[PDB]
Design a protein around this ligand. Structure first.
Ligand SMILES: O=c1ccc2c([nH]1)CCC[C@@H]2NCCCCCCCCCCN[C@H]1CCCc2[nH]c(=O)ccc21
Ligand SMILES: O=c1ccc2c([nH]1)CCC[C@@H]2NCCCCCCCCCCN[C@H]1CCCc2[nH]c(=O)ccc21
Ligand SMILES: *[C@@H]1O[C@H](CO)[C@@H](O)[C@H](O)[C@H]1NC(C)=O
Ligand SMILES: *[C@@H]1O[C@H](CO)[C@@H](O)[C@H](O)[C@H]1NC(C)=O
Ligand SMILES: *[C@@H]1O[C@H](CO)[C@@H](O)[C@H](O)[C@H]1NC(C)=O
Ligand SMILES: *[C@@H]1O[C@H](CO)[C@@H](O)[C@H](O)[C@H]1NC(C)=O
Lengths: 528, 528
């Protein structure tokens, strides 16, 4: 039977799922690590012990313990990102969609979820991998990994909570795919890892980390890059945050051992309830527990690794959305609301820039404000709102990605860059938010091909084109089928817009603003 | 006889001069101070001793000792600014053009020349006051004053070379006009002082200086303002420069007395030959001997005087030209030449910004470069050349004038602002230089009304309109005859373009760039 597969960890039994009036096989909830519970909380993952008998992989697994968004109860725009299965620390599982009949050796794509390293589930309706696996005939895998304090609490020097264990969870899932996917019909020589936001940062992190490089072939980064300002902290900052988390739960703070033991006795929800209290600054687009530059998973600073070519050399496809910042301003800056056009006063603008660059002195805040203010019309609410939206997206997503892509391309074997700017016709979020962080995903997973979701015919066509670019790149290292998406080169820096109209090619994506964020501001903050 | 006038200093005999197929009276070379020669070099001027008999004022006086431009021998573009009479330290004279027949009490305009405080003559063909005096029926006066070391060498504390004596020369000429112009038919209650470049800065300086305020009624500033970065130095800098001038002429430097005595024994040309050697930095748009913030002519810093309203409250008319910087780049920055289009490499751009803001550290130079570079097309020679031209004009002329006009308007009694952007049809300078520093003067003096000069009919009409705006403002405090040039107000900040087409009104002249030069950069240079 097509639904029975034997792996090095044991036998697994999948389920047949309907898709676009056809069917494919799904193997849901396959364990790839021992449950990281009890004394294992905060520690590096352990490989799953093989089992005798048949593992029932007919149903989605639990989601890892995480913050649950309750801002708009019942609103699908926000709830579509919340765990849709029960939460449990026993959550290290992966899901596989396999074309029917079973391929012999086909392209594999592995999806890494990305809610700021503090949230995310492999089971969301928008991550249903059946449409992509079916339409492009690829073996689709979605993994999971611990988020928040459970995956990133870091007390460098301790082996009990060394940090980066969520990244090590991802790596273990990639090790399992490398070692077992051939049994499901996947080609272990041709695995593409892809992810959005923190998943896009994670993808870039495995490209950098020596210990992860050999587990995959190529990579896709969507609105996220390893060097993002919110994606990592120093070991000293990680340490202070863990100590502050301990302080919020009245823990003995005398030694690492005392702190960790205290933290291990708390119910999951007690850690999540105070997680946001440890940020060192009043801020937006900053998350408490994130990867640490530790000297092990990352041998040195991300910038010297990028500068010296210390990273996997292969092909990458990556890009950003037009309004990366809106989601974060809506949820965290004064003057923005879901049900209004959110025109911002000059005062809210200024308080928004302070929130957006928490690490800046007054001179730096003045430099951002001058850069994004139209002084001929400074009281324009729309320009203020939009300027703030660009500050957040440029600083947190676009310019760090552009810096990553120019550094990478100097040593890599092929780069394709995109700018996604299509506002979906059925978007439930307000107009002012534009092309939102995360909203290209539904096109990558082919949701527009399902009629009941109400997309237009041109949106279904856009989805088909993106899925085929992603799968063709995964299979060959080039999104084009031999209108051509041109290679991004050091010299010409070309990229394409991705939307419903004829493909346009442009050059130097947001160069003007990114010279400010990547070269001028850091110099300013460092000199002063 | 119309040509004989009796003054408090004695009788003066003028000459009849032809103008536009008519005639008017001219009283040229009337002395208003004792010659500042010998032991009087560097000292405050002394009032001219009255004379018995008749002063022959039929011919232009000598010009003060100054640097002579020899860059383009015989080229009229440059030579039109050079002294056209013999140079002499005996040069403190004024010229008067009087309508015929002699008015009883008409509006008076007094012109202050302005070659960077180191050059200028009241006798240039472009300053011939007969056209304006005749066409607008005003009594026109042009004064003179010592320039260079002779007028601005400053050794604060010494009474032998206290500094600002060139400004005191201007003041003495204004005192003489106040006391005697009624005899020539001028109204001492209605005197407008006007000047361009350093003359525009000087005008603003008499508006600020308590000791000059009561000598005139209203003021016109053309491409110059008192707070310009090149218009004044501290007493410590003035002192260092005088000491360095002494060092270049092998003077005993033991005391002020020794230095001054040494300097007084040098021929005029020996001082001028080394004048440029005392600048403290490699630079452009910086002059050696300029006014000093001394605690006397200027009671405190120009900025606190501007901020506190410590200045004459009256009406002012002022403005700038479109390409104020070109003259200075041509003469002093690498890559610019008179006979080529002067497209500038990225390298010459950068070396041009260093020259343009000599007082800036590397971070500030980076801030100017980022502000003026189109990073999508950074190797564009034309954009590089034009960006540099704007940096020079914005930093040296436009933004300081805008800062002056916003501070002044808060306390003044009426402000009219203009932007002159007409490229004359017969300009002999290259196209790349645009609307050059100083080239609105010929329109203010009505040169286009003389056919042999080859201007177009629309240029003659532009000239007539500017002369009538200037004279009507001088007479009433409003350029408009009761298409209206609107008042510049704190709130709306309106100004008009001055050129051959229908008047357009705009707001906030170069605000974007001036917030950078007036608010951000100074903060940056001060913090770091
Ligand atoms: O797999 C996943 C899971 C979720 C998501 C994606 N992917 C991709 C698309 C985006 C989505 N998550 C977007 C989610 C939108 C981001 C903001 C959620 C934080 C709310 C709780 C904290 N509230 C405040 C106080 C703390 C600081 C702070 N900081 C802020 O930036 C905003 C609010 C606040
Ligand atoms: O009454 C007057 C007299 C002259 C002028 C005007 N008005 C108004 C219109 C302009 C004209 N003067 C413009 C004149 C154009 C400005 C430059 C003349 C300086 C040349 C000598 C010094 N050569 C170099 C070395 C020293 C530093 C340095 N710095 C520089 O900014 C340029 C060159 C150099
Ligand atoms: C597989 O496990 C799920 C768990 O709820 C259950 O629905 C299904 O009956 C199981 N099938 C087998 C063969 O155990
Ligand atoms: C990638 O590598 C191959 C072989 O190593 C080389 O021939 C090719 O030119 C490279 N492609 C790019 C875009 O660098
Ligand atoms: C006036 O002085 C000038 C000086 O050159 C001379 O040309 C003219 O003859 C003089 N006239 C009288 C009346 O002295
Ligand atoms: C100027 O002053 C007069 C009288 O002192 C006043 O009535 C008038 O409004 C003022 N004009 C401006 C533009 O301030």
């Amino acid at each position: 039977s097509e639904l029975l597969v034997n792996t090095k960890s044991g036998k697994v039994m999948g389920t047949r799922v309907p898709v676009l009036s056809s069917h494919i096989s799904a193997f849901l909830g396959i364990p790839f690590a021992e449950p990281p519970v009890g004394n294992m909380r905060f520690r590096r993952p352990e490989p799953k012990k093989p089992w005798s008998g048949v593992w029932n992989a007919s149903t989605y697994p639990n989601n890892c313990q995480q913050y649950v968004d309750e801002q708009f109860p019942g609103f699908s725009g926000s709830e579509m990102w919340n765990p849709n299965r029960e939460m449990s620390e026993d959550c290290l599982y992966l899901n596989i969609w396999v074309p029917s009949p079973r391929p012999k050796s086909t392209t594999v794509m592995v999806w890494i979820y990305g809610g700021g390293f503090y949230s995310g589930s492999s089971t969301l309706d928008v991550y249903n991998g059946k449409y992509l696996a079916y339409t492009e005939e690829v073996v689709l895998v979605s993994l999971s990994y611990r988020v928040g304090a459970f995956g990133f609490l870091a007390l460098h020097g301790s082996q009990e909570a060394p940090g980066n264990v969520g990244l090590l969870d991802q790596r273990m899932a990639l090790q399992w795919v490398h070692d077992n996917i051939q049994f499901f019909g996947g080609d272990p020589k041709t695995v593409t890892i892809f992810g959005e936001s923190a998943g896009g940062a994670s993808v870039g992190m495995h490209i950098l980390s020596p210990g992860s490089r050999d587990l995959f072939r190529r990579a896709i980064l969507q609105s996220g890059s390893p060097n993002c300002p919110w994606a990592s902290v120093s070991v000293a900052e990680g340490r202070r945050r863990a100590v502050e988390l301990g302080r919020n739960l009245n823990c003995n703070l005398n030694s690492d051992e005392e702190l960790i033991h205290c933290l291990r006795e708390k119910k999951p929800q007690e850690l999540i309830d105070v997680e946001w209290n440890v940020l060192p600054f009043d801020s937006i687009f900053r998350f408490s527990f994130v990867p640490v530059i530790d000297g092990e998973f990352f041998p040195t600073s991300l910038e010297s690794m990028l500068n010296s070519g210390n990273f996997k050399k292969t092909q990458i496809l990556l890009g950003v959305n037009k309004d990366e910042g809106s989601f974060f301003l809506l949820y965290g800056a004064p003057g923005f609301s879901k049900d209004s056009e959110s025109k911002i006063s000059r005062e809210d603008f200024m308080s928004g820039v302070k929130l957006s660059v928490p690490h800046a002195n007054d001179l730096g805040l003045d430099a951002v404000t001058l850069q994004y203010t139209d002084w001929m019309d400074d009281n324009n609410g729309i320009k203020n709102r939009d300027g703030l939206d660009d500050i957040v997206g440029d600083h947190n997503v676009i310019c760090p990605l552009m810096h990553f892509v120019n550094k990478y391309t100097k040593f890599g074997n092929g780069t394709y860059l995109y700018f996604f700017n299509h506002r979906a016709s059925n978007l439930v979020w307000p107009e002012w938010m534009g092309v939102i962080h995360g909203y290209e995903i539904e096109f990558v997973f082919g949701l527009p091909l399902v009629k009941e979701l109400n997309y237009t015919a041109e949106e279904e066509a856009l989805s088909r084109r993106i899925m085929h670019y992603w799968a063709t790149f995964a299979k060959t290292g080039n999104p084009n089928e031999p209108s051509k998406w041109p290679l991004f080169t050091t010299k010409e820096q070309k990229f394409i817009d991705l939307n419903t109209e004829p493909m346009k090619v442009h050059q130097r994506l947001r160069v003007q603003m990114c010279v400010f964020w990547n070269q001028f501001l850091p110099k300013l903050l460092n000199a002063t």
